[model samples]
Target: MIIKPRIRGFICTTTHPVGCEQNVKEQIALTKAQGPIANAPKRVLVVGSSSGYGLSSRITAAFGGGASTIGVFFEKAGTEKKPGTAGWYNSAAFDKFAKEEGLYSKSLNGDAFSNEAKQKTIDLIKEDLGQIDMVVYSLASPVRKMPETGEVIRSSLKPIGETYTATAVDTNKDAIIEASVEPATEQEIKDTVTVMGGEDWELWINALSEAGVLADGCKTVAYSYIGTELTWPIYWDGALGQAKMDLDRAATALNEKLSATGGTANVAVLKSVVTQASSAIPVMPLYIAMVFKKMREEGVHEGCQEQILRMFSQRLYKADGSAAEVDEKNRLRLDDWELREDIQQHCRDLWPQVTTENLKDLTDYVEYKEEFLKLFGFGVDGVDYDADVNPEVNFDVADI
Candidate 1:
């Protein structure tokens, strides 16, 4: 179904089904081109499987590593009045593509915050694949409700305890503008931790283990991003950063739990990409554009699809039947090389050189903008935008 882009605040209200299909197809093509993974899992569960790195992880595990993936995410579906959100369209598209590839793919659409959702997934796995061999956590949400306590937990993208000035794109005017947002409140910091922290991850592992659903020697990984020195203060030092740090620490405890079962928990630090999740962060766009330009010129640029594909093949699975693993820090340094001191230095040098007129020429801004537009099903090739954009398309996604 045709759908137009509708922006509301920091979110999108519309999505294109055909365009989402095309986007998933492109991701599949990239995954296949990356070649086969040797020690790939046969069954996988990916939380937040609708967009960004989670979707990438699912695709890589399924297509590149020969995995059967059960996806869990929070997304909207099509209705009589409006089209589904991009994540909804994306989930439907993924399930469709995966089935076509002779793989078992199903998705659960609901809050991953609760033990109920986690248990539901466990039941599905039992009913189908019997057990899951790998788990990839890539959930990024602004808020979540605590399942055990039924408490509302929320997070923010703004800086905490300090007012930080930054730059953002005025997509309406197609201009970059300097802007400053209010610093987060004290409660905001605590709530951000409650929501974005790794409690859900731990709960998933605990539930799966208790239910005897974890495959022997199974490995679990989560996505995290620690940007360069410029963003470290706001990202790795502020409320959001604190949440990720908590997540990182939780990985250690999760590792100890998994050790008994020969399972592992590692965090894959991803390089910058303009995903719906990452775009909302302050000053990240400017840094991303600069990094993209520098990395592209040096022939070292990669997106979410590329990142996950490499992670599964080069890092998680190797040729000798043994997997290439990460260190005890629970950190896998994927973006570290991309944002090396030299790379960041060059990006810092080139950051001031970027402007609206030369933005596309200076960096991978063309590709970035295309990806952003495609997030809401706009500007995709081979899709007729003039056709009737009925938002009433159906999605197969379900609540927990």
Candidate 2:
């Protein structure tokens, strides 16, 4: 049946299957056009491979690097009456495109934070691909539960020591407002770290290593962000920041171990793009919108596909198999373009001046909304949204 975007909480509740296919195809096309990546992965495992940076990672690895991939994601499947999540359609389209290209793409739809998922992925790799040369740990979620103990852990997006009030976009009301959030308690901080930190990534690596599914000189990377000062209160210096610090610690530990076998683990600080994960964050939507406007004006903005493809081609791999350059803290700084001082200074100048009346002139909130809609497969060039389509589409994905 015909589908339209049903907006709730500043995100679309319904997905467009055909538009999703088009979106995937466009990313693949862009990746293929960029030419081959040098000394890239031959077999890759993307932990969160359905949307955002993770989905773009899968596309770049498969289409640009010519790598076979195994994807793990948790997403809802669609029925006849209702559309599935955008990631669902995105994954289905990815599998189809990879199949057409004869690239080995296998996906498992389940929790990547579980032991069974890890074991199943290991078995699949051993059975088919033999070993993985790269692992992209890009999972994003609000809550995590202990697989063995049934303990629930939820991450938060609040300040660490004080209440942070900032300009925010109330998309449900189409207005700009100031939102305030109190600091997280110790327990809340710990739980946020438990849910979003790098422990699960470390677990996946350890499990893969024990299973002998990791090849020599293997590389693993997880995505992160450290935005401008305007975002410091709620994002950079907040609970999410603490979680990222934990991620850094995990990378340090993993890097030491992986280095013994000519392998490495890194956390790539990526740009903040419009995603299902970031759309609902209190201050982030506004920050991202303004950043988009400034970055685009400076001619330095990149979409998910462009950013991930560059990370693979430029930072993660070299033309001669040499180690990629990194910052003092040993991170892959993919946000170099986004965090350019001149561009950020512009954002700093605009933050205080933005109002509901001047929002469009001062920020890219319109573009932000469109991008957010695209994440759920709403806006695409060729897709006819008024036409009837099946919501119950399925990709031959496996589960543990």
Candidate 3:
């Protein structure tokens, strides 16, 4: 069943199975061509292992590191026109490849924060692999339901304390306008913290540790990004930034909790990648486009999958026997490398001159916009946009 694209929030209402598979295939092939990893784990678990950096990490761990992976995500899979979401297609691609490599691979398609889904995953792991040598916590969602208490915790991306003026796009009109958003209330801050920050990470760690699911000397990592001063007031220093700060602190607490088990928790401050989540934020597209253009020109541009591959192979999984170390800030620094001084300066200088007329060539705005549209199956290089695309064939990202 051929369908077009639809949009709700950060995710698409419909996903193209073949196109998503193609995306995964390209990433897999790229990983394999990049060569093999040493000290790769055998059994791995990845939360939020469906799309973006999470999916990339899973692919690298499997093909690059020879790990048998169990992925947990919120995605949809079916036999209809929109057979599956990107994560579902990604899982299919992963399962196909793992089978060929004689590595066990299974996936859980549901809420990672829920007890039901978490228990199902636990049961699967205990019944099959018996234990996991590594776990990757890469979940990024706008909301979550508290499994234990049956309460909903929602997240927000708005700033706190002070209202901020930022820029946004009117995609339909091909225009840019200034956006002034009010600060998040105290309740909003707390709710966002509950949903997006360390609470869930800590809970997952405690549950997995108690179950003895984590192998001895097991390692856990989460993805993060610390943008520059230009974006700090609106991003890394704002609402999302608050959540990330808590996430980093949670890693520290997790390390302490797992100390006796020889388990460690580290957070990777990853490079900028196009995720279904990141594209919706204000001003990020422009930043991403500029960064991509500059990095590509500097010969360092990489997508989500490529970024993860480099993070693991070149940085996390060191060639030497020593463990990887991050800065004192508790976030592994990659965005710094991506948003270098020269690149940031160039973007700052060009920011004032960017307009719809010159945006496509001035920055990676066209590509960024297209990528955002593509996340929901709206854009493709050769696809006919004038054709009717089914909207009724929508999907729930959590119905894995």
- The candidate that wins on lDDT is 2
> Cα lDDT of model 1 overall?
0.79
Candidates in order, TM-scores: namely: 0.92, 0.97, 0.90
Model 1: lDDT of residue 31: 89
Per-residue lDDT tens digits of candidate 2, residues 198-310?
A: 99999999999999999988989999888877768656789999899999999999999889889899999998888877865678889888889888888898999999988
Ranking by lDDT: 2, 1, 3
lDDT tens readout by residue for model 3, 1-400: 4565665434567676555656667778899998888877778889888788888888999999988888888866655344556667767767776788887788877778886766776778897888888888999888989877888878777777787776655545546667666788788888887887888877777788778787887888888777766567646767887888798899999877767767778888887776776756667766787778888898877787777777786666777857666688655676666777887788888888877777678777777767776554455444555644442232222343
RMSD of 3: 3.5
lDDT per residue as tens, model 1, 232-277: 5567878878788888888898888888868888888888888776
Ranking by TM-score: 2, 1, 3
Identify the runs in model 3 with alpha carbons over 4 angstroms from their true place: 6-12, 79-82, 373-400
Clashing pairs in 2: none
